[PDB]
Design a protein around this ligand. Structure first.
Ligand SMILES: CCCC[C@]1(C(=O)O)C[C@H]1[C@H](N)C(=O)O
Ligand SMILES: CCCC[C@]1(C(=O)O)C[C@H]1[C@H](N)C(=O)O
Lengths: 278, 279
């Protein structure tokens, strides 16, 4: 009944293929589909069915047992989390804004531009802006002199983020020089940034706090250290996105508070999010 | 001289001391702040007494009125503390802004959704939430530990409480009625009282604001206290400068705070006032 959109980002949402011999998503996974175009000219395409698992998938399973709803999970195709591009929202935010999905689940950072057009769950994952450097690099945060005067260092201090998300907006809306310097170090994905950090091609990676803490926690060899931005103005959390004025915000929040109360949340946190390093 | 600003005493964010009587002056890192004290406990008759104010949020106020270039009149709230709707009327610092007795409210003021329906808030400059403090040695995973869920399963019953009428009590009473009703018998009148009961073994856990508990555990004489996050992620927020609803000054106050965070002035205040020595 309920159309729910998600986005793949480990460890919160992990996407794998279905076994063709089964027609089944098994173990801890649930069925999720994707509308994939036939080529790069039309929008013509068809659904391909996949399997989805992760921390927020397990939250969705708990939510639809407790609130007692059935759902059809699908993966966003136009954009990622959410950005206003040419005055139209893309990503998961757009799917809720334009009422193609009743809910959006995943590593969706609650911010203030987004909550002008969608209603939000209570935060269930603490997040913000964090800085990750190679183990050995010493930075106090985003206010360090390597981030404010990068040309004082040889080579110039190399740091960047993943564009079009919650982190870039917080930098672009408040510190224009920092943002303009960063875009030449735009990192396409989390995995690319960690490779350049450990190989010495990047000095610092600015990104979401929850993702960076998880990646540093179970990194092969414990080579990555994460420190808070110090941008306390950007502290927030992941939230389930609902349509503006949604009648389900009340019951979705009540179920999440139950999980936080009875320990289901902390037990989910030690299944997916705990780390080993530091 | 122009802007009336209300604050509330809570170390290390606001520390209140008396004026030197030979001078009538506030010197060093302190600024003049006044208090309206009643003459007795019968009428509302009273007079203003002048005091000196210092701390982390006082130093934020000094930077804001240098950068934005305003002069201010600092006074200490007398009816209530931070802010609560009592008999459908707001008291404390929130009430002073709601009823237009103060243009701004500065201090350990936690941003929540009930407060921001009647006042506007700066961007957060101190991240806070709900935290649990126990004696070093007590093992709790958070507020969802079964010592909190089922306190009567232990002998004696698990003794934990908070300070009433604040952000923490509202977050618990609005969502977990049994936990709140059990806590009120362990209501702590102040932070200092709760730390004494923890170190003497008369209280098992102290739920309170995260920033204050992290500071108190950081500078405890002997490092006797351990702080752990609530796990109540729904209650994560921060301290904010309270302004009247639709205030034209929220924009300029935010721009100055964002400048301090950008140029390192904030990190200089945080390691002068808030960093600790214990772990
Ligand atoms: C655009 C890919 C990465 C963007 C993210 C960021 O900018 O931090 C991670 C997203 C964040 N959780 C959000 O919801 O915008
Ligand atoms: C009135 C007792 C103080 C309780 C507080 C809390 O609830 O944690 C500390 C307050 C908090 N900073 C707020 O703004 O309410």
């Amino acid at each position: 009944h309920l159309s729910i959109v998600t986005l793949e980002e480990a460890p919160f949402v992990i996407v794998e293929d279905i076994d063709p011999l089964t027609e089944t998503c098994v173990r801890n996974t649930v069925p999720c589909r994707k509308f994939v175009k036939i080529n790069n000219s039309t929008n013509e395409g068809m659904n391909v069915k996949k399997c989805c698992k992760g921390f927020c998938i397990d939250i969705l399973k708990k939510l639809s047992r407790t609130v007692k709803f059935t759902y059809d999970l699908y993966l966003v195709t136009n954009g990622k989390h959410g950005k206003k591009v040419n005055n139209v929202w893309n990503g998961m935010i757009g799917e809720v804004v334009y009422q193609r999905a009743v809910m959006a689940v995943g590593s969706l950072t609650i911010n203030e531009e987004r909550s002008e057009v969608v209603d939000f769950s209570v935060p269930f994952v603490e997040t913000g802006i964090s800085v990750m450097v190679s183990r050995g690099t010493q930075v106090t945060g985003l206010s360090d002199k390597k981030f404010q005067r990068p040309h004082d260092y040889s080579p110039p201090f190399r740091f960047g983020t993943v564009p079009n998300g919650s982190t870039e907006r917080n930098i672009r809306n408040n510190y224009p020089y920092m943002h303009q310097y960063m875009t030449r170090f735009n990192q396409r994905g989390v995995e690319d940034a960690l490779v350049s950090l450990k190989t010495g091609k990047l000095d610092a990676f600015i990104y979401d706090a929850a993702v960076l803490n998880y990646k540093a926690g179970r990194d092969e060899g414990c080579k990555l250290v994460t420190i808070g931005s110090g941008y306390i103005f950007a502290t927030t959390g992941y939230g389930i996105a609902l349509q503006k004025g949604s009648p389900w915000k009340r019951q979705i929040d009540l179920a999440l508070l139950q999980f936080v109360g009875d320990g289901e949340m902390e037990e989910l946190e030690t299944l997916w999010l705990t780390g080993i390093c530091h």
